[PDB]
Amino acid sequence: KYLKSVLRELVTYLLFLIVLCILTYGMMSSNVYYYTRMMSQLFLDTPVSKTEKTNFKTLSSMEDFWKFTEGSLLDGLYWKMQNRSFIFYENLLLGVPRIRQLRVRNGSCSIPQDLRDEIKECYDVYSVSSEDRAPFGPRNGTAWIYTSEKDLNGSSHWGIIATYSGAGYYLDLSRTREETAAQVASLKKNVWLDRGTRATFIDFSVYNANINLFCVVRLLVEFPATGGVIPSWQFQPLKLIRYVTTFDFFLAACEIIFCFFIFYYVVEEILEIRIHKLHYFRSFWNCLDVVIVVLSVVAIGINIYRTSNVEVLLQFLEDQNTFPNFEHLAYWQIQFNNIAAVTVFFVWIKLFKFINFNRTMSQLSTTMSRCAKDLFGFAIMFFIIFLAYAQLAYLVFGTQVDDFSTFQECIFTQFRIILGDINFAEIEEANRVLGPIYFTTFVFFMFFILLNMFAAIIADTYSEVKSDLAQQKAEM
Amino acid sequence: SCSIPQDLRDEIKECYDVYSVSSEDRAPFGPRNGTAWIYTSEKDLNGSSHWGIIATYSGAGYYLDLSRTREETAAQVASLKKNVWLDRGTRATFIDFSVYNANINLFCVVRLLVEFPATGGVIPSWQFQPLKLIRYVTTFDFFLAACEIIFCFFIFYYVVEEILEIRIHKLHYFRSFWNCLDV
Ligand SMILES: *[C@@H]1O[C@H](CO)[C@@H](O)[C@H](O)[C@H]1NC(C)=O
Ligand SMILES: *[C@@H]1O[C@H](CO)[C@@H](O)[C@H](O)[C@H]1NC(C)=O
Ligand SMILES: *[C@@H]1O[C@H](CO)[C@@H](O)[C@H](O)[C@H]1NC(C)=O
Ligand SMILES: *[C@@H]1O[C@H](CO)[C@@H](O)[C@H](O)[C@H]1NC(C)=O
Ligand SMILES: *[C@@H]1O[C@H](CO)[C@@H](O)[C@H](O)[C@H]1NC(C)=O
Numbered sequence: 001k002y003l004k005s006v007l008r009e010l011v012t013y014l015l016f017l018i019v020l021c022i023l024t025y026g027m028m029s030s031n032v033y034y035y036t037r038m039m040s041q042l043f044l045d046t047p048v049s050k051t052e053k054t055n056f057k058t059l060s061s062m063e064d065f066w067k068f069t070e071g072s073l074l075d076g077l078y079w080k081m082q083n084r085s086f087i088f089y090e091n092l093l094l095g096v097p098r099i100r101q102l103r104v105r106n107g108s109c110s111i112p113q114d115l116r117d118e119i120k121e122c123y124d125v126y127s128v129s130s131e132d133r134a135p136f137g138p139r140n141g142t143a144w145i146y147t148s149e150k151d152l153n154g155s156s157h158w159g160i161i162a163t164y165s166g167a168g169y170y171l172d173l174s175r176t177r178e179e180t181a182a183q184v185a186s187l188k189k190n191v192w193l194d195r196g197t198r199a200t201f202i203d204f205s206v207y208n209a210n211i212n213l214f215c216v217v218r219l220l221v222e223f224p225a226t227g228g229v230i231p232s233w234q235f236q237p238l239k240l241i242r243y244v245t246t247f248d249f250f251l252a253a254c255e256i257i258f259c260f261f262i263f264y265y266v267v268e269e270i271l272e273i274r275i276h277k278l279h280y281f282r283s284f285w286n287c288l289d290v291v292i293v294v295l296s297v298v299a300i301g302i303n304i305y306r307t308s309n310v311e312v313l314l315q316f317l318e319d320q321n322t323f324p325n326f327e328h329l330a331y332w333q334i335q336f337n338n339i340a341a342v343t344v345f346f347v348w349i350k351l352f353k354f355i356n357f358n359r360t361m362s363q364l365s366t367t368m369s370r371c372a373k374d375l376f377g378f379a380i381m382f383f384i385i386f387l388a389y390a391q392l393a394y395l396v397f398g399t400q401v402d403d404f405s406t407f408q409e410c411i412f413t414q415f416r417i418i419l420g421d422i423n424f425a426e427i428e429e430a431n432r433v434l435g436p437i438y439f440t441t442f443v444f445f446m447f448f449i450l451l452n453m454f455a456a457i458i459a460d461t462y463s464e465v466k467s468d469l470a471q472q473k474a475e476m
Numbered sequence: 477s478c479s480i481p482q483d484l485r486d487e488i489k490e491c492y493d494v495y496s497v498s499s500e501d502r503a504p505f506g507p508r509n510g511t512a513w514i515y516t517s518e519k520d521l522n523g524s525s526h527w528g529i530i531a532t533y534s535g536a537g538y539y540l541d542l543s544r545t546r547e548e549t550a551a552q553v554a555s556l557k558k559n560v561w562l563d564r565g566t567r568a569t570f571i572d573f574s575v576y577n578a579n580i581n582l583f584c585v586v587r588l589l590v591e592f593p594a595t596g597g598v599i600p601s602w603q604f605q606p607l608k609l610i611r612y613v614t615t616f617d618f619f620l621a622a623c624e625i626i627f628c629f630f631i632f633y634y635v636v637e638e639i640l641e642i643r644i645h646k647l648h649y650f651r652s653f654w655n656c657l658d659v
């Protein structure tokens with residue numbers, strides 16, 4: 001035996017690895033990149049007007065946003081056809097773009113009594129417990145009346161400053177440029193962006209009927225309570241009419257095959273628990289074989305949930321003069337790509353289970369298996385001092401650099417210091433006593449004394465392993 | 477060459493697919509006047525593939541030869557621009573020419589390519605290649621002509637030595653790694 005058992009589980013795994021490769025080949029095409037790039041270089045790179053240089057990426061005031069809304073925005077959405085408006089003469093703008101704002105209410109924080117004669121009013125930072133819900137200005141339409149999240153069919157966004165809800169004051173722009181511009185001018189005249197505003201969303205979607213691939217676009221502008229403007233963007237190439245070409249039928253067949261494979265792998269792994277070895281996990285080849293199954297189950301459930309309800313597309317196709325609410329699908333597509341990309345990584349890592357075909361591949365794995373116990377002990381000691389530097393940098397420089405503004409950024413900056421990437425031209429500006437001292441001590445202690453021990457140990461281990469084999473050859 | 481979904485067939489009246497040999501145009505368009513509006517096969521054009529950035533374009537297509545001087549060339553390209561010679565179906569455009577530059581003896585062949593992807597936009601790509609016709613000019617050449625013959629003789633000697641060695645050692649000659657690098 002041992003060739004009808006340790007090889008059958010390899011041939012059944014090679015087919016799995018081929019089906020997974022076929023499934024991950026069809027997800028990422030080559031036109032998707034240019035489709036996103038052309039749209040990205042249309043709203044974020046053109047200057048707001050011919051006489052200025054700023055674009056959406058470098059907005060720095062509430063007047064720049066107004067210049068962008070009437071200007072570089074309307075020049076991209078509406079194109080005179082050689083009535084609908086194809087963007088690049090292929091990208092059909094379906095529906096109408098929608099704009100929305102979220103604002104806080106007056107008198108929302110506490111003014112110290114000492115200087116209350118100067119501070120007339122304040123507006124607190126954004127929070128669900130301090131969000132305005134009352135009409136303001138002329139109470140004509142839906143742009144001056146608080147509409148809840150339930151009847152907006154909205155959802156949270158998790159922006160940069162905070163996490164904004166799906167309610168607020170919204171307005172659906174028109175279908176032709178000459179009246180959308182009038183609506184924007186009316187919004188600008190009767191001041192719609194007061195100081196109490198905290199967020200603004202502009203969103204739409206396009207089709208590009210040549211290939212079969214939608215594209216939803218959302219642009220966010222955040223106004224922190226400490227003044228300023230922070231822009232953000234998101235372009236997502238959805239696809240909702242999949243079953244058209246024969247290749248789509250082939251992909252459907254290959255994914256039913258994947259479902260069958262995951263069923264087989266879950267049953268033949270349950271069979272090895274109670275009908276066989278009980279409660280032995282510390283092998284790293286069964287702890288990994290469970291992660292793949294769980295991730296695949298999650299990714300299958302997400303995929304079924306995503307394509308089980310496309311009713312928003314049907315509603316839009318019923319009447320094509322409204323706003324297509326494609327925001328939900330664009331989120332689950334990202335959440336599904338984030339899972340289907342991690343499963344492939346672990347499936348590829350699983351190939352190490354079968355590379356022992358000669359007497360020189362066995363010791364190269366024995367070395368790692370015998371130095372993975374000693375490296376783990378030193379890793380904790382390394383990463384404790386790593387975090388000790390990270391938190392000190394966060395507390396000292398994390399106010400005037402922006403390379404240490406948040407703790408994660410502090411960690412990534414040190415990882416980039418290890419690569420020798422960042423230059424310390426501005427570190428000393430935030431502080432001079434601890435400016436160059438921090439850099440020098442960090443480099444010295446973690447690039448000449450602590451980063452080596454990871455090498456030495458490994459080297460030593462390798463040596464003994466070789467002996468621990470060579471002597472065994474001398475015995476025979 | 478495209479399949480609109482039935483759901484929104486009324487809104488899109490036509491779509492053009494991504495370039496592919498199985499989905500190329502072969503019919504005249506616009507004023508069917510001359511060679512710029514009639515499909516010509518690759519054989520009749522003496523062309524070949526290119527392997528551009530988006531795909532691999534064939535050698536056929538709709539072509540036009542310009543004039544020898546500026547005036548008629550400008551008039552002819554303006555006549556092309558007056559009509560619509562670059563419709564929505566156009567997928568690639570090639571411009572080819574060659575120059576001599578007699579001042580220093582060095583030819584040059586120039587090919588420019590513009591690709592219009594099926595998602596709108598323009599992708600340019602150029603290629604210059606200088607050629608030379610220096611054979612037996614000054615008194616420095618003959619040296620290279622003799623060196624070429626010497627090199628050919630050396631290769632003949634090396635191959636005959638290699639065949640002798642491989643005849644003596646009928647096999648196991650393909651493991652020293654100093655024989656693979658010699659063949
Ligand atoms: C905001 O409230 C403060 C205090 O009530 C006062 O300045 C005024 O009522 C409001 N100011 C506005 C709406 O500009
Ligand atoms: C409110 O009335 C119309 C729309 O109902 C609007 O155009 C007008 O500007 C508003 N009136 C004002 C702001 O006084
Ligand atoms: C939310 O969805 C319902 C479902 O029909 C729709 O009637 C309503 O108009 C949507 N909300 C908005 C603000 O369009
Ligand atoms: C493209 O072909 C379709 C198929 O009938 C036709 O309806 C449409 O008018 C054509 N468009 C052009 C520009 O010829
Ligand atoms: C077609 O060519 C003739 C001469 O070859 C020219 O007189 C005529 O104007 C051309 N057609 C058009 C539409 O220009």
Ligand SMILES: *[C@@H]1O[C@H](CO)[C@@H](O)[C@H](O)[C@H]1NC(C)=O
Binds near residue numbers: 520521522
């Ligand atoms: C292709 O080569 C033939 C052979 O000389 C020539 O007659 C023909 O004109 C060439 N094609 C073109 C488009 O010039």
